[PDB]
Write a protein that binds this ligand. Sequence first.
Ligand code: CLA
Ligand code: CLA
Ligand code: CLA
Ligand code: CLA
Ligand code: CLA
Ligand code: CLA
Ligand code: CLA
Ligand SMILES: CC1=C(/C=C/C(C)=C/C=C/C(C)=C/C=C/C=C(C)/C=C/C=C(C)/C=C/C2=C(C)CCCC2(C)C)C(C)(C)CCC1
Ligand code: SF4
Lengths: 80, 118, 732, 107, 165, 37, 144
Amino acid sequence: AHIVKIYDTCIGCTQCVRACPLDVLEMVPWDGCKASQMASAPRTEDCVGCKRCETACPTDFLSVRVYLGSESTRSMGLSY
Amino acid sequence: GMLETPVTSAPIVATYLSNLPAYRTGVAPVLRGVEIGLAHGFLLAGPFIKLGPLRNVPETAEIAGSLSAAGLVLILALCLSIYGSAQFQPLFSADGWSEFAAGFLVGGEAGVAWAYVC
Amino acid sequence: HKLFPKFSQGLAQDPTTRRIWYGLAMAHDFESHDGMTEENLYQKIFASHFGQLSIIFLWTSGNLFHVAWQGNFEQWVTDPVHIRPIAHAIWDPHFGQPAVEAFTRGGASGPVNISTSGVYQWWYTIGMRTNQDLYVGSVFLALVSAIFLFAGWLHLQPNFQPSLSWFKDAESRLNHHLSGLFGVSSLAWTGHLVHVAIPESRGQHVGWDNFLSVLPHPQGLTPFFTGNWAAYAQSPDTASHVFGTAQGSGQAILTFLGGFHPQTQSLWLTDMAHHHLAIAVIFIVAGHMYRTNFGIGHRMQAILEAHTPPSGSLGAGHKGLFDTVNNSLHFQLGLALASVGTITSLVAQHMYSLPPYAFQAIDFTTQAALYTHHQYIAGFIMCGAFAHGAIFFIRDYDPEQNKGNVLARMLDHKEALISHLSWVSLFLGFHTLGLYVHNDVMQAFGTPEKQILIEPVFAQWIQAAHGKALYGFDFLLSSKTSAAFANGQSLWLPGWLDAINNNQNSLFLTIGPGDFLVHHAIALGLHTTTLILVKGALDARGSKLMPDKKDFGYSFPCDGPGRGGTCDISAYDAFYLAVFWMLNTIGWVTFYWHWKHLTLWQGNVAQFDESSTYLMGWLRDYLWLNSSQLINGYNPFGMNSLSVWAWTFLFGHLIYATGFMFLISWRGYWQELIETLVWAHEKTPLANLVYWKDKPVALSIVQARLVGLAHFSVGYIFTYAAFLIASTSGRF
Amino acid sequence: THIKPSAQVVWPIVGQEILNGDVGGGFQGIQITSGFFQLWRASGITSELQLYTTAIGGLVMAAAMFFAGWFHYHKAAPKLEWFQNVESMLNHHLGGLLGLGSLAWAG
Amino acid sequence: DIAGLTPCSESKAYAKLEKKELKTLEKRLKQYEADSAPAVALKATMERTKARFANYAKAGLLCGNDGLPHLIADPGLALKYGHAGEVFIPTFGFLYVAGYIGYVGRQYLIAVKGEAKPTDKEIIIDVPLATKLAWQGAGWPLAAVQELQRGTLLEKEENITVSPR
Amino acid sequence: PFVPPSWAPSVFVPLTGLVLPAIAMATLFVYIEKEAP
Amino acid sequence: WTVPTLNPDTPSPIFGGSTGGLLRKAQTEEFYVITWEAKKEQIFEMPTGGAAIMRQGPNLLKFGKKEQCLALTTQLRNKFKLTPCFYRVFPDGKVQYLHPADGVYPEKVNAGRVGANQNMRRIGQNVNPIKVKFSGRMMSPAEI
Ligand code: CLA
Ligand code: CLA
Ligand code: CLA
Ligand code: CLA
Ligand code: CLA
Ligand code: CLA
Ligand code: CLA
Ligand SMILES: CC1=C(/C=C/C(C)=C/C=C/C(C)=C/C=C/C=C(C)/C=C/C=C(C)/C=C/C2=C(C)CCCC2(C)C)C(C)(C)CCC1
Ligand code: SF4
């Protein structure tokens, strides 16, 4: 399973969520930004590590980070 | 679903594949092994005789060809044995595949020995 | 899940074929295993170093055994000019009778290989005369290898495991190593030379039978304890001495004559004896420097805390560096590999020009093989030095324990470092390539008198400073009225001058504008490879494209296509890109070495002087010309003894080309192809009853770069070794 | 049979003049391998004047093609259903282009 | 002379190479007419060859054991033995023209950064401003050392760096 | 008494060329594919 | 909103059968089953290759990985304005519902979700790799 972390520089633009091809991230209530939205990664067991989320994030630097960890059958994207 | 095809789903092809010894579902793995070995060693005896390095020296071409065929059958039986040792931890079990590999060894050596006489 | 690999349960739970390759590639990276502590790390490293020692001594015992049983060593020593050294016999049942006839060269019973490794000259110089001595040496070294293997097993046992304080004791280890392992070993080698190897060259057998009854000097130990040490330099070997006999012999055991023996064209044994004796005394004195449990001695942390200059030009100086060398193993391995690579370059540079062993430098294929071998060894070891330095920065560097010292101030001005390395690389590339292309255009248009030929007056100035009377500068060793010339004249200069004013040896070869252009190409290759390696070491913590690069590690594939795309961004990938330049640079130095020595050995150095100033002269007169007998090793008319080097030449071209596949084509093509193969196997009847246990996937990106660079380098080495050995052995 | 076809000459500067080699016919230039000479002899061309006239003609046709481009983009640009008449396009190209081409060439 | 090199006017392989090139040119010449254009071209080639060898022997070049001109790159040795026109005067000529180009480019960059569209002046060149800076850049070493001595040649540490600096 | 006999290549070369590589690859293949308890 | 259930007797879309379908992962490990309710009969692109007619009403397809179900969900959601949901099916018959596991799609905020894997700091405030050496495994410094 890979390691996906969310950092407090998130501005709740929801871009990372709508970029993941695997439905790993979601938006939660929060009070740290004007949008009152923060990302969260409750389903990192299905994450393949494609890093579309990191591409979609506007902040400098990134507020979502994917650390490629141990591989499984789900993280390798195997249909077999 | 699976792509419907007159090659993958032909009746006479299905009966022919059901008649071959890898599919009969109720014969012993030793019998499957000796039949598969009597087929494959008999066919493998050929090109070692006709094309091997001793093919033009008379009286020794068939001897060296069958001896190399028997060595290759022994290597194949060792491959079957280590495949069964790595795979399962009636044909698809450890005891059944070990009986199948021993039957392939016996049938392949018998097929090479029968091809030397023929 | 599966057992293998037992050090990583993250790899053991991998359902793919990636598990096997990553268990192989991560077996010896002990710092990142499951449950690895620091004491366990040092203990496994200590046992692994024992294992390397045992493999080295088993390798040497095998060389000795195959020379003693299959070589012609007892026949080689009688006429070492006209008899080829035999490495080992050939038993290849795939052979035919022309190959058995052609590899039965002489004087052998069957097919044998002719050695280029130079072990006969070394063994004959250090005193071997018979095969039985080599058998005794092989049995002794197999016994020593078994002892080191047992000690590697032994120091892992729980009553024999050393503590962490034993490994981090730096003063005791430097004192014992510099005293014992250097000075006592050099003193014992002086003892070997004086007691055995000098009398064997005098025609007298000194073995374990009679060494307690044969005096090395006719007055033993009375000049040594009287202090009359000049008595051991009296009556050296005459300039008409036949090596291995008593004709023209001497009595001295410790001289300093300079130059070469006249017959063997090699260094004097008494000079090497007083060499090892002097440096033995120097290392035993140097090993009494640091503070062990005796009150006297230097304290290394106090030395590092002292050397901080005023005005703050180095900041905090060397403060806090003792806890970054002693606590880190990658820093120590980087220092060790930097030193050993530079020393290996030194070994090659001083063994081609000052050949130590008897009847070396008349065996030309041995010269070329030894130089090329140790130069490529040095190149790989230097790239490993910079790689483990980048690994130090990623894993072991603590910035709070280095606040203001020299190592942090290197990270502070890293952009100026990389920029000035970029400037010298671009300068040397533009002007060296421009001068070569200019001279190629002048040679093409029929006017060689227009071509830019810059004379190397600085290195010729150095050669005149060392005593070479060809360039007419006449200063400091070349002028008779010099102070250094007059002071060194009685003792070591008359051999050095006779050997440096000979144009038939490799001692300070005559140089010119081709040598100019190639030395600046060598500077280009060194500064460019240093640019990639230093830039990988310094941008390892992070760059502006990737500020958190230290959080991913040393060897990660990429960071994805975002931010413009980040391919080959890790420090491992900078190592990967720098191995190509290392191979390039050592290829330049060995093309240059080999072609200048081929033109020396043939006689026409004018051919090199005329053709080395333009790259078409290289391609025509070194690569095309010297590969005629190579590629004629086998042909439709027959074969000869060079057919194995022709097959190895094509073999290297093939492995090179196959590595281009892994370097050019990348993963996702192959992963889609393997998915179609998985479908094809699971749908084929009577073969889908057999099914894989590990799921087949493509090679990973980092694995692709390693496999491509591996095939690339192996094909590079085999191609050039085949060409070099075949040309130098076939034409001489 | 004893003259090498050459139709490129270099100017005498920086020594590149050596490229003008002895191709025969009292000429010095670069031997060409495009095969234009054989194509011109096969077409019945005998003088340099006819080749010059063909050069002027081809230049005129180039000017006509660039005018046709500018015209059919900026002044009178065909509609989409003109381009989609593929049956008519095949008829006109098979008759007029290949057919009348090889007819006029046979002529 | 220097490094055992003979002068080219004294070297014999120099004259041998001159004679060999004239021999190749006259072997190519002797298969044409007298007043034809290949004959005129080859005679101009031979004239330039003789003039080039006379000019190289005139300038005091040093030839080697193969008869080719060698250059001396040491300021004091070349100024002592009269070889300053081959590296030393060419290196200061190059530094003049290279610093010319660099100073004109730097003044163009600083001139176009002070506008509302610096990139748009970088793509589409302001030709009058470029020609003005190109003519004014002849006093570039004086202006360069004056910008060096005022501290306006350098940017301070307001530069872009990485988090470990 | 060091010299190995004249038949020693004809036995030792096919031994470490075929038989010990086969035993080594078979033992390593069985060790790779073993399930953890 | 409550968690829905899998009806195995749901009619599949009209499709002639591809070679890019299921493999032995469906029989040995898992396969994922998508379900949506259509408004009309209309052709869509199958993510495994080819075209297929969906039926008016409920539909049912089974794929081999999660990304195929997300690709079909994104296609049916952005082009046809539909609300699908895909499940996880084991060879025992165990059914695991997900997407939307909240019931509301994750591209908009909903109360009741608990934030997981959120570091409450910047990325420059991570520790150095020297601080996490000699743990039980490899650790990136962002793990703590
Ligand atoms: C791939 C191309 C190729 C081919 C066709 C050959 C062919 C040959 N080699 Mg050479 N060899 C090759 C590559 C090849 N080699 C390479 C790359 C090397 C260097 C590594 C060598 C090194 C080498 C050596 C050292 C020697 C040979 C020898 C031989 C000869 C006998 C080999 C033998 O007995 O095998 C046994 C043959 C088989 C087991 C045949 C299996 C293939 C069958 C026919 C496939 C059947 C498929 C079938 C149509 C499917 C039907 C399906 C249906 C039933 C449902 C034969 C002419 C020997 C010789 O003396 O040369 C004359 C020999 O000593 N080769
Ligand atoms: C490095 C070890 C090694 C050794 C010792 C040999 C030895 C031999 N090979 Mg080579 N071979 C090898 C590696 C080796 N091979 C590799 C790595 C390749 C791929 C590059 C090949 C590719 C190859 C081909 C294509 C052919 C050979 C052949 C041969 C035989 C030479 C021809 C001959 O005149 O013999 C006379 C031949 C005989 C007396 C009959 C050979 C039968 C042997 C002796 C049976 C061995 C019995 C043993 C139980 C087998 C199982 C061993 C296993 C359990 C470890 C000889 C036995 C030829 C051959 O097979 O000859 C028939 C042949 O056609 N080899
Ligand atoms: C001086 C001793 C020395 C020691 C004790 C170490 C120790 C280490 N190195 Mg270092 N290093 C060294 C020298 C040393 N190295 C040298 C000389 C180089 C230059 C090549 C390097 C370059 C280097 C890199 C780039 C890396 C290391 C890494 C490592 C660590 C793990 C090694 C491992 O598990 O891979 C196991 C090794 C293999 C599986 C080797 C595979 C085979 C290679 C590619 C060669 C294949 C050629 C083949 C043999 C030719 C056959 C030809 C055929 C025809 C016969 C370990 C700390 C790694 C690390 O620290 O990661 C953070 C790492 O990434 N080293
Ligand atoms: C022969 C092939 C080749 C050449 C010429 C180069 C050249 C270069 N490499 Mg590359 N490299 C190569 C192979 C090569 N490499 C390979 C196989 C790899 C492994 C992937 C690398 C990996 C690599 C790395 C990792 C780095 C380099 C760098 C460099 C530059 C070094 C500085 C220098 O010498 O500038 C002199 C310039 C040249 C020699 C290039 C020729 C420029 C010509 C003369 C100018 C244009 C002429 C003409 C007007 C063009 C007309 C074309 C027309 C269509 C308009 C130089 C451009 C380094 C760098 O960027 O340093 C600043 C660097 O860090 N290389
Ligand atoms: C079958 C078609 C065909 C073939 C084989 C030829 C053959 C020839 N032409 Mg002619 N030509 C043709 C039609 C063809 N022509 C047409 C349609 C035109 C008007 C555009 C011309 C206009 C033309 C001119 C102005 C000249 C020639 C010349 C020549 C000769 C020179 C070599 C050459 O052109 O390569 C051979 C060409 C081919 C092999 C490919 C032609 C394919 C055509 C375009 C499509 C045919 C498709 C057909 C239905 C199936 C054929 C499939 C395939 C095997 C080709 C050669 C005899 C030269 C000459 O007269 O020298 C003495 C010359 O100056 N041709
Ligand atoms: C790039 C480095 C470099 C190197 C290796 C050389 C090498 C040399 N220089 Mg040159 N030179 C250089 C750059 C260099 N130069 C530069 C940049 C300048 C302008 C400042 C000069 C200006 C210059 C003059 C005026 C003279 C030399 C001379 C020499 C030769 C002997 C110098 C000596 O013995 O002192 C050791 C070498 C150095 C310290 C290297 C730096 C050289 C400095 C700049 C000048 C040293 C001159 C020396 C003190 C005078 C010796 C007098 C001689 C009769 C013994 C030697 C070949 C002398 C000569 O012509 O000998 C035949 C001489 O008279 N050089
Ligand atoms: C270690 C270096 C080394 C190398 C590279 C070689 C290489 C060779 N040996 Mg020699 N051998 C060696 C040491 C070595 N030997 C030593 C020290 C002895 C004395 C015991 C021998 C005794 C010997 C005999 C009697 C013969 C050879 C022969 C050969 C040749 C054929 C290969 C073979 O079958 O050998 C087999 C190897 C042995 C019999 C001894 C090696 C035993 C050591 C302890 C193995 C070490 C294990 C190794 C480090 C790791 C293996 C496991 C790993 C691969 C997974 C080949 C040139 C044959 C030959 O000469 O052909 C013409 C032959 O007949 N060797
Ligand atoms: C990355 C890194 C690293 C690495 C680095 C390296 C790898 C380096 C290299 C280095 C080197 C590789 C160096 C070298 C050096 C050398 C030198 C510096 C030398 C000098 C010499 C001299 C000085 C001499 C002189 C002389 C002469 C010439 C003659 C006369 C006499 C005399 C002797 C005086 C480390 C580990 C730190 C860590 C951190 C990171
Ligand atoms: S990596 Fe692929 S899966 Fe993991 S988050 Fe970014 S997009 Fe979603």
